Amino acid sequence: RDFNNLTKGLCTINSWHIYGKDNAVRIGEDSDVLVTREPYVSCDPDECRFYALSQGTTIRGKHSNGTIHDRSQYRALISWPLSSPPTVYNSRVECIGWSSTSCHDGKTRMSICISGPNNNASAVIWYNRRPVTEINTWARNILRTQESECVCHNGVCPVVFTDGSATGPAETRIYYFKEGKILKWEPLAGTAKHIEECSCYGERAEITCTCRDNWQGSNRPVIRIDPVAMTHTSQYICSPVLTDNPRPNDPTVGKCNDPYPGNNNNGVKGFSYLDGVNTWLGRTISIASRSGYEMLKVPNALTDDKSKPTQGQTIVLNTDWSGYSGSFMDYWAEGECYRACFYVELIRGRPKEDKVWWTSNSIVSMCSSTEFLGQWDWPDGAKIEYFL
Amino acid sequence: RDFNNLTKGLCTINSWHIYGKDNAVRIGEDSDVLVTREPYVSCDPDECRFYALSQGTTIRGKHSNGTIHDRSQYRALISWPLSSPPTVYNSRVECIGWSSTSCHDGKTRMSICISGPNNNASAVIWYNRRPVTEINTWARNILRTQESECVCHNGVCPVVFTDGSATGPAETRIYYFKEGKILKWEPLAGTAKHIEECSCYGERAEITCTCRDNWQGSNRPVIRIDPVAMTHTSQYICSPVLTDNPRPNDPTVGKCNDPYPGNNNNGVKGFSYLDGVNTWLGRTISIASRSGYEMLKVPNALTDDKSKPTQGQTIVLNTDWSGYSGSFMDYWAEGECYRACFYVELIRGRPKEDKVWWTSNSIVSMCSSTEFLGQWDWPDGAKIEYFL
Amino acid sequence: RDFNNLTKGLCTINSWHIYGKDNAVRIGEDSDVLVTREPYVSCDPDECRFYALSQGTTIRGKHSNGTIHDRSQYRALISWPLSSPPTVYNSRVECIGWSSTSCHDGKTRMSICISGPNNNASAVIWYNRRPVTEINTWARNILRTQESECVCHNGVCPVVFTDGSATGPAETRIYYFKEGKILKWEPLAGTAKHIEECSCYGERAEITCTCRDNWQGSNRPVIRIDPVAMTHTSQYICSPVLTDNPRPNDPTVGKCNDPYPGNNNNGVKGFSYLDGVNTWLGRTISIASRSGYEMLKVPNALTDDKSKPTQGQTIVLNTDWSGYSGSFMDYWAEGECYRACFYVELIRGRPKEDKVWWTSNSIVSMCSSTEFLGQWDWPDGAKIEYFL
Amino acid sequence: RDFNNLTKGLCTINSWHIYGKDNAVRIGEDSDVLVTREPYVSCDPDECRFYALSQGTTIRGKHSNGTIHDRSQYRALISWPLSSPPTVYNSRVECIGWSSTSCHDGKTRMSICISGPNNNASAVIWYNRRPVTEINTWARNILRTQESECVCHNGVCPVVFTDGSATGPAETRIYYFKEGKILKWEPLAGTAKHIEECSCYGERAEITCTCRDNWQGSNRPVIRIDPVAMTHTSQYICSPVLTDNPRPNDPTVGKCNDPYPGNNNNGVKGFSYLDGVNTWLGRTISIASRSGYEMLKVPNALTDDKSKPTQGQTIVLNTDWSGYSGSFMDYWAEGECYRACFYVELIRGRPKEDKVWWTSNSIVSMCSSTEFLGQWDWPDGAKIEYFL
Numbered sequence A, B, C, D: 001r002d003f004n005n006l007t008k009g010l011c012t013i014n015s016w017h018i019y020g021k022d023n024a025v026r027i028g029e030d031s032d033v034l035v036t037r038e039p040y041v042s043c044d045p046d047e048c049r050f051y052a053l054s055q056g057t058t059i060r061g062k063h064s065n066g067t068i069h070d071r072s073q074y075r076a077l078i079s080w081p082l083s084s085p086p087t088v089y090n091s092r093v094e095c096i097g098w099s100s101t102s103c104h105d106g107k108t109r110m111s112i113c114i115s116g117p118n119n120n121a122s123a124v125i126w127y128n129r130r131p132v133t134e135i136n137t138w139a140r141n142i143l144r145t146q147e148s149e150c151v152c153h154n155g156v157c158p159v160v161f162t163d164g165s166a167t168g169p170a171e172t173r174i175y176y177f178k179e180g181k182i183l184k185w186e187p188l189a190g191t192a193k194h195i196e197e198c199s200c201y202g203e204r205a206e207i208t209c210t211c212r213d214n215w216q217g218s219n220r221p222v223i224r225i226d227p228v229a230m231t232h233t234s235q236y237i238c239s240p241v242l243t244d245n246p247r248p249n250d251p252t253v254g255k256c257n258d259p260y261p262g263n264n265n266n267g268v269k270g271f272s273y274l275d276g277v278n279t280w281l282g283r284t285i286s287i288a289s290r291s292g293y294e295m296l297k298v299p300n301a302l303t304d305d306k307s308k309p310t311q312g313q314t315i316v317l318n319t320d321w322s323g324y325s326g327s328f329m330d331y332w333a334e335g336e337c338y339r340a341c342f343y344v345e346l347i348r349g350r351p352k353e354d355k356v357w358w359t360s361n362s363i364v365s366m367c368s369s370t371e372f373l374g375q376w377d378w379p380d381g382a383k384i385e386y387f388l
């Protein structure tokens, strides 16, 4: 009925509780589960759902062979009920393509999918399940977007896109949509040197995005957006607790306005919540590969270049595979504050598990608690040997 | 609540963006996907869906053997959610038969299915999911209809049927339905010599249908219907850009009131949008078989017998299989103009791929953009070898 | 909102058009289709659905072995969308048991299922999907009911039950329910000597049921019920066109008040519409087995002991298997008259096809047309050899 | 719209009629049925559903190997339509974990799931399908709850939890929730010495729970809760008809305020309805293992230490496997009294049937009748040999 406004602050995050888990690869060993990757979670006013990019085959299907590849004509943004797996029979297609974002503005949902060949890709912006706007590639090098939910305020839903090199300067733009129409766009500003795969959340009329500098940085770039003024800025997380992957060992002092060097041309989508002393960072446990996952409480990470952990929680053990991670919240929940949430993609199959010819994932997701809760670890749980 | 009226003109068509794609044959390699053919797309006021004729077996089922055949007691018009595949578990049966059409009038949906033996077929006209009217064969030779959506204006939904020879004169009728009841019917008039499988769209209170002259023409016949007066006329597309299949090579000058000769007794369902300079024609790329698919901008194709392409877009490469194609639009979208859409049926299996014993298809669909978007090609994507 | 009243007469029946067909055995060869028997069709105010008794296993499942048996703890009344097959994933359980009926009163639905051992069976009467009333066996010999829909008038839904011998006198009762509560019951009256499996329809505030005299009659008993007075009578169809199975050859003169002899202790559920000159009878084509199915127009069949066919329609060829048949109508359709409908159960597997270890069926259904439509035949269509 | 109040008494229980049965293990032999255990039934105002703890694999899936284990990261509370089986495609996840409860307060549903390692478990309390409250382990030894529905009165839904030893004193708490928030909690009081797995029902503004004393008692502890005062008491069922399993032979005189000795450190979840002369107890038929199931009418069982059976009903034969059992009622049914209902979990596979590597169950459920109905027995019905 009305556009949602970001009128609340974050709840105090004292730990993380289990929210959803689909066990998709376990279940899909003997049921019609679609192969996916690049999952996320997004809420409507009356339901929260899982989202991902399908590969247009089931996991036991012979067409699962080759699904390490990111971009084909067989991919689509799908959604399905929370903690169910993405099946052929329960998955709803939001739009067609191989990079996406989606968010609800309080009245209805906007979904964006990009498709095409590398040098001629286009975004289609859907609103109320109809296409409304299209945007052609501006740099002819894999036009691409967040791979997790966007955020709206009074109808304005900003979205970050990048077109251009993954290993050098690229052209990043912030589009401000309303009802699927372009109100404005701006080129990236501030000190972030490279942006991909922004993970965003909204509180007190400001949207914060934690992104991936694929080119040089092992610290994460941060974009902060004012959706009323339709302006933004950028920087890096100051903290020496480095949250990209792969990455060097953690130093004692980080960088606020430059990439922290030591690994080039690689990364992973990740997130954080940056809320002064209530600041929590996610990362892989391994510095070398996408294994394990942990949350660290790092007070003032955004602004304090010597900030270190005061608390933490293990989400996935370093002996289990992780993957992309991102933020979402239920903006329509009851109460006085928005409860921080996140997901972690649990990648299985190639390239790390190459006895199978496929790559897919399952999902785990948590939300914050004001209690100090006991921790478990949450692995995918499938046995690869069963698929041989 | 109210009957929809065709009050808008076409949006300007500068390119085509991806709308839906089901990847059904890929997915159906290892899931309970129904064998189909003769698909299309049709919108309700709150949802757009895929439609097709089921063959009453799954593709991996042993009853898929023999599904090259067009007309059996096991066929039905089914619908399913946009870009999902047609599964046993998500497909809704609209009516029983082996030729169909369907459209929503703004209040509810009319669906028409024809069944029976060749010499004794009948149409049943369903409205609000109940049968209302029946029409018996008038020429005793495969009574048959559009195989894509009809169009309504203020409750009046015209439909084109043909009964009689596929390779000689036949008896074509235009029925004007309202609430599933016959208001009137007329015998075909104008200069079209043979009509099958009309593909129709509505704008500014007129309905335009691009059809298949199976007998003689490689140019397509066009029927234009005034749904208020309940009258029509017919002609051929004047343009030397010929759009049937198979067909001769394109000449320099076409025919406005006669079939363009060079192939007899064969054809394929196709479509066009005929809107002066905003005119786009679809066709197979091959002159000999149903391979490839392209859209050509041919200004004034309907009326200019020397009109040639000023722009185009490849939809399916000539090294991939195509099939039937047809028009639809979302008459209930927001904005000032109706956005042209189309689908292409991607036929797999027999007769061209005869290592399998079945014939089925998947679907790809696009809508127009006012941008000049980059093009991809959109093949079915299944590997036949997997099915051996 | 209001209880439906039977205020209309039957439409004129000049032929029969296809209404629904599920092709369940064909589809179930390679999908999760439940084994059933004793199907029927019943309408709500906004939807019509297929109903049957599940056997609590899929057809390809190993538990399909033994499903020739009628009565087990694994059976349930299920419903599913019209012309879909009865799948594990789309079938809704109405109640538990091995004999049933169901009807909608205009406000909500009553469903009745009987379960138990032969000598200690009970009916549970569900209303608005909650159990309301229970009725214990009165004769300790397979309490049993219609196996097709009941009919309501101003909230009163009569139902016919039988308890006692299948091959001798039994105790038949007519229960008058309202909101799932017993208003009254009466013992069978009139001249019918044995009653099973009544097939009923409603018009002009009277309900007519055509039943099965399993003991002696090859003519069918008829019960006529006044749901306002809550009284009834019974007789047999007078016509020499005999409609049970198995049966003797047709004579020239039938019996109005006694069973027509020649076969004992056997029969099949069937139906008719008895409406003076607008009278149509269904029967198997074979006198010996459940093969084929036809509709015969037999003017005044109910009252004229020499009435013979003036018109007919083949539904299933005598070279294809049939089974139970029954009546239903869409009481909530638009227009001035109720359109007669029926289904035929197409039994496959045992005992006639004993290369498989199972018994199941599919469904075909038709409704009347005021046109004289061409006829097709409508077989199950599955190849038993595929299941070996 | 309004919170439900427990304003009715129990209906008179003269027998039990069949309510639901899913036949899940039979069906799951050849369909995508999830492995479960710890099932129950719970009603909303407009629907009643089956609930259980999934094991996050199908039964025919290779991940079914190991599902004898109770607590893993792959478990979730799921619900599905009454008498359907718990499939991958129709099951809705309520929350994540390995111990649960759920109930509807008349406005919306509260669901509670506990997860974590044995020494660090936490409960998350969901309301209106959103997490609201979290509760950390207080004794660091398998925090755990009812495994059947809770009950609400004017918004207050008490829930019994236990944390601590299964074979010695433990710390049991009664939490009083409203809208998912903690109003109050109390430590267990009265004479019950050990509490697990309470099975609860509501009548005349009091909630009665029949639980499992795993430590010493073969008589069942009873907790009675006043949800207005938010106080409770506890005792044991006085009757010498002992209802735990395993258990000693029945004596002539029971114990009201102490555990009845003879078996230690073991038990099974069970239930009763304690309503003076209208008192019925459920139990396994075997004293040694979870086989068979029966209901006994034991007047004044709660308060009369010599009460013996005056009537009974066999539910499952002693030659068939049983399991957990629990109470529920449809608080939103029509009429003057609440109809007592229960389910029995039918465990198949390990440990008793160790030719398979899995453990799962199906469900049977009954409700009371004021008739004296005939009895059947209701086994799971699957053949283990089919799974070899």
Ligand SMILES: *[C@@H]1O[C@H](CO)[C@@H](O[C@@H]2O[C@H](CO)[C@@H](O[C@@H]3O[C@H](CO[C@H]4O[C@H](CO)[C@@H](O)[C@H](O[C@H]5O[C@H](CO)[C@@H](O)[C@H](O)[C@@H]5O)[C@@H]4O)[C@@H](O)[C@H](O[C@H]4O[C@H](CO)[C@@H](O)[C@H](O)[C@@H]4O[C@H]4O[C@H](CO)[C@@H](O)[C@H](O)[C@@H]4O[C@H]4O[C@H](CO)[C@@H](O)[C@H](O)[C@@H]4O)[C@@H]3O)[C@H](O)[C@H]2NC(C)=O)[C@H](O)[C@H]1NC(C)=O
Residues within 6 Å of the ligand: A240, A241, A248, A249, A250, A285, A286, A287, A294, A295, A296, A308, A309, A310, A311, A312, A313, A372, A373, A374, A375, D119, D120
């Ligand atoms: C039941 O559940 C309980 C709740 O989950 C659980 O208690 C939790 O226990 C975990 C695990 O111990 C805690 O997480 C850690 O928290 C550390 C921070 O807390 C310490 O430091 C604070 C400041 O100096 C102290 O205040 C704090 O003391 C307080 O709390 C204590 C309880 O833990 C209590 O005893 C005290 O009385 C007091 O009240 C405490 O001392 C945090 O630092 C740690 O993370 C590091 O360690 C991990 C390995 O264990 C790494 O994976 C992680 O990345 C962090 O280390 C790395 O990064 C650092 C920053 O750069 C570097 O300095 C390190 O060298 C290290 O870097 C290497 O590794 C990196 C990752 O591979 C790499 O990238 C680098 O390159 C380099 O190679 C962890 O998060 C949690 O806070 C506890 N929570 C609560 C509420 O108590 C309890 O144990 C469970 N109970 C049972 C019985 O099982």
Ligand SMILES: *[C@@H]1O[C@H](CO)[C@@H](O[C@@H]2O[C@H](CO)[C@@H](O[C@@H]3O[C@H](CO[C@H]4O[C@H](CO)[C@@H](O)[C@H](O[C@H]5O[C@H](CO)[C@@H](O)[C@H](O)[C@@H]5O)[C@@H]4O)[C@@H](O)[C@H](O[C@H]4O[C@H](CO)[C@@H](O)[C@H](O)[C@@H]4O[C@H]4O[C@H](CO)[C@@H](O)[C@H](O)[C@@H]4O[C@H]4O[C@H](CO)[C@@H](O)[C@H](O)[C@@H]4O)[C@@H]3O)[C@H](O)[C@H]2NC(C)=O)[C@H](O)[C@H]1NC(C)=O
Residues within 6 Å of the ligand: A119, A120, B240, B241, B248, B249, B250, B285, B286, B287, B294, B295, B296, B308, B309, B310, B311, B312, B313, B372, B373, B374, B375
């Ligand atoms: C990123 O995506 C971009 C958007 O898709 C893409 O740009 C697009 O590129 C495609 C492919 O080149 C274009 O499609 C073609 O358009 C042709 C018409 O445009 C030409 O002619 C106009 C009039 O004279 C000119 O105005 C126009 O110039 C303008 O635009 C230029 C850009 O392309 C630009 O450089 C100029 O500066 C200027 O501004 C341009 O010259 C169209 O004619 C063509 O279709 C024919 O060719 C196809 C084969 O390629 C056939 O498949 C097709 O059927 C047509 O040829 C056949 O039919 C004709 C008519 O009868 C016959 O005359 C021909 O002989 C031929 O007939 C044979 O084949 C038939 C089919 O098999 C057969 O039936 C006959 O029997 C006979 O055998 C094609 O549609 C598109 O318009 C571009 N779009 C845009 C917006 O620019 C860009 O390339 C992509 N970028 C990258 C980096 O990959």
Ligand SMILES: *[C@@H]1O[C@H](CO)[C@@H](O[C@@H]2O[C@H](CO)[C@@H](O[C@@H]3O[C@H](CO[C@H]4O[C@H](CO)[C@@H](O)[C@H](O[C@H]5O[C@H](CO)[C@@H](O)[C@H](O)[C@@H]5O)[C@@H]4O)[C@@H](O)[C@H](O[C@H]4O[C@H](CO)[C@@H](O)[C@H](O)[C@@H]4O[C@H]4O[C@H](CO)[C@@H](O)[C@H](O)[C@@H]4O[C@H]4O[C@H](CO)[C@@H](O)[C@H](O)[C@@H]4O)[C@@H]3O)[C@H](O)[C@H]2NC(C)=O)[C@H](O)[C@H]1NC(C)=O
Residues within 6 Å of the ligand: B119, B120, C240, C241, C248, C249, C250, C285, C286, C287, C294, C295, C296, C308, C309, C310, C311, C312, C313, C372, C373, C374, C375
């Ligand atoms: C396109 O579709 C059209 C519509 O479906 C289709 O036309 C239809 O054609 C069918 C098949 O011919 C017709 O069905 C039959 O109708 C018979 C009754 O009609 C005749 O009798 C009337 C009265 O004397 C005449 O009025 C009537 O004449 C009129 O109509 C004619 C068109 O058919 C036309 O030419 C005339 O000008 C005139 O206007 C006509 O002569 C009906 O009797 C028949 O049923 C019997 O025969 C079946 C075998 O074919 C049996 O299966 C069936 O059970 C009936 O016979 C059995 O039972 C009788 C009664 O007891 C016995 O007397 C018989 O001996 C026989 O009994 C044996 O078999 C029993 C069953 O096994 C058994 O139990 C007994 O023991 C014993 O062993 C049939 O229903 C239909 O009416 C036509 N409909 C229309 C609108 O015209 C047209 O053919 C199709 N076109 C093409 C090109 O394919």
Ligand SMILES: *[C@@H]1O[C@H](CO)[C@@H](O[C@@H]2O[C@H](CO)[C@@H](O[C@@H]3O[C@H](CO[C@H]4O[C@H](CO)[C@@H](O)[C@H](O[C@H]5O[C@H](CO)[C@@H](O)[C@H](O)[C@@H]5O)[C@@H]4O)[C@@H](O)[C@H](O[C@H]4O[C@H](CO)[C@@H](O)[C@H](O)[C@@H]4O[C@H]4O[C@H](CO)[C@@H](O)[C@H](O)[C@@H]4O[C@H]4O[C@H](CO)[C@@H](O)[C@H](O)[C@@H]4O)[C@@H]3O)[C@H](O)[C@H]2NC(C)=O)[C@H](O)[C@H]1NC(C)=O
Residues within 6 Å of the ligand: C119, C120, D240, D241, D248, D249, D250, D285, D286, D287, D294, D295, D296, D308, D309, D310, D311, D312, D313, D372, D373, D374, D375
């Ligand atoms: C059609 O369906 C009808 C409805 O279901 C069905 O009739 C029902 O029949 C069943 C089975 O007979 C009845 O259930 C039993 O009811 C017994 C109680 O009723 C008796 O006792 C009363 C009081 O003294 C009498 O009033 C009553 O008489 C009345 O009713 C009669 C009809 O049955 C009628 O003939 C009379 O005229 C009169 O009107 C009647 O005599 C009940 O006691 C019994 O349960 C015990 O027995 C079971 C074994 O059969 C055990 O499994 C069960 O656990 C109970 O015994 C155990 O526990 C007792 C208590 O501690 C011990 O004293 C016993 O020794 C025994 O203990 C051993 O076993 C335990 C379990 O393994 C173990 O833990 C111990 O350690 C020890 O090892 C049973 O529930 C039912 O009430 C009938 N219902 C109705 C309405 O009539 C009819 O039969 C069906 N018809 C056909 C044709 O099939």
Ligand SMILES: *[C@@H]1O[C@H](CO)[C@@H](O[C@@H]2O[C@H](CO)[C@@H](O)[C@H](O)[C@H]2NC(C)=O)[C@H](O)[C@H]1NC(C)=O
Residues within 6 Å of the ligand: D002, D003, D004, D005, D106, D154
């Ligand atoms: C259950 O009892 C409560 C307490 O008496 C009822 O609560 C009142 O409901 C009315 C009407 O909806 C409100 O206007 C009052 O404010 C409520 N509270 C109190 C404390 O009186 C409630 O309606 C009852 N539930 C049902 C289904 O009748």
Ligand SMILES: CC(=O)N[C@@H]1C[C@@H](F)[C@](F)(C(=O)O)O[C@H]1[C@H](O)[C@H](O)CO
Residues within 6 Å of the ligand: A285, A286, A287, A288, A289, A291, A292, A318, A319, A320, A321, A352
């Ligand atoms: C899932 C897994 O086994 N990850 C291991 C953890 C650890 F042993 C590690 F050394 C690490 O990176 O910390 O290697 C990982 C993994 O085997 C490699 O990094 C990549 O193969």
Ligand SMILES: CC(=O)N[C@@H]1C[C@@H](F)[C@](F)(C(=O)O)O[C@H]1[C@H](O)[C@H](O)CO
Residues within 6 Å of the ligand: B285, B286, B287, B288, B289, B291, B292, B318, B319, B320, B321, B352
């Ligand atoms: C799908 C496909 O391979 N089509 C080819 C394209 C081309 F090579 C062509 F020569 C053509 O017709 O243009 O043959 C098609 C096809 O192999 C035949 O036409 C029919 O088999």
Ligand SMILES: CC(=O)N[C@@H]1C[C@@H](F)[C@](F)(C(=O)O)O[C@H]1[C@H](O)[C@H](O)CO
Residues within 6 Å of the ligand: C285, C286, C287, C288, C289, C291, C292, C318, C319, C320, C321, C352
């Ligand atoms: C389905 C089928 O083949 N039915 C035949 C028809 C006919 F040949 C008939 F002789 C008949 O009864 O009319 O036998 C049936 C069937 O084979 C037997 O009656 C029973 O097996």
Ligand SMILES: CC(=O)N[C@@H]1C[C@@H](F)[C@](F)(C(=O)O)O[C@H]1[C@H](O)[C@H](O)CO
Residues within 6 Å of the ligand: D285, D286, D287, D288, D289, D291, D292, D318, D319, D320, D321, D352
């Ligand atoms: C399902 C089953 O066969 N249960 C039997 C019943 C009975 F024979 C009994 F002796 C009993 O306990 O009463 O053993 C059960 C079962 O075999 C064992 O108790 C445990 O294996």
Ligand SMILES: [Ca+2]
Residues within 6 Å of the ligand: A212, A213, A214, A215, A216, A217, A218, A244, A245, A263, A265, A266, A267, A268
């Ligand atoms: Ca990086």
Ligand SMILES: [Ca+2]
Residues within 6 Å of the ligand: B212, B213, B214, B215, B216, B217, B218, B244, B245, B263, B265, B266, B267, B268
């Ligand atoms: Ca042609």
Ligand SMILES: [Ca+2]
Residues within 6 Å of the ligand: C212, C213, C214, C215, C216, C217, C218, C244, C245, C263, C265, C266, C267, C268
């Ligand atoms: Ca008989």
Ligand SMILES: [Ca+2]
Residues within 6 Å of the ligand: D212, D213, D214, D215, D216, D217, D218, D244, D245, D263, D265, D266, D267, D268
């Ligand atoms: Ca015990």
